[PDB]
């Protein structure tokens, strides 16, 4: 049920950032993505792999294949320089898990 994601992604402003997360559990259940800025609580960006909250702009999208899920951020701006996390839960609902977290550098 562990979630693995790279420690960092480097993207130039205007480019598309692709932050991946992998694990066996992700082929079974949906992933959720959070964005955390320093000094702030985590904010949900994507749920059910590819759906957005009403407070999240169309620049954020998601996809999945096999045991890997990806958060895609197009038109990356300075405001997107945050720590992104992948989240999931086990098959019995007794445990919640986060990945290490990816620092996205713009």
């Amino acid at each position: 049920y562990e979630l693995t994601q790279p420690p960092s992604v480097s993207v130039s402003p205007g480019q598309t950032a692709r932050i991946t997360c992998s694990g066996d559990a992700l082929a079974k259940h949906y992933a959720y993505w959070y964005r955390q800025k320093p000094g702030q609580a985590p904010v949900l960006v994507i749920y059910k792999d590819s759906e957005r909250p009403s407070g999240i702009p169309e620049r954020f999208s998601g996809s999945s294949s096999g045991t890997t899920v990806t958060l895609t951020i197009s038109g990356v701006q300075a405001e997107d320089e945050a720590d992104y996390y992948c989240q999931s839960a086990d098959s019995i609902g007794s445990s919640w898990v986060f990945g290490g977290g990816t620092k996205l550098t713009v």
Partner: peptide, 8 residues
């Protein structure tokens, strides 16, 4: 017995 809908 627990069951789930396998995403893939």
């Amino acid at each position: 017995l627990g069951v789930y809908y396998h995403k893939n």
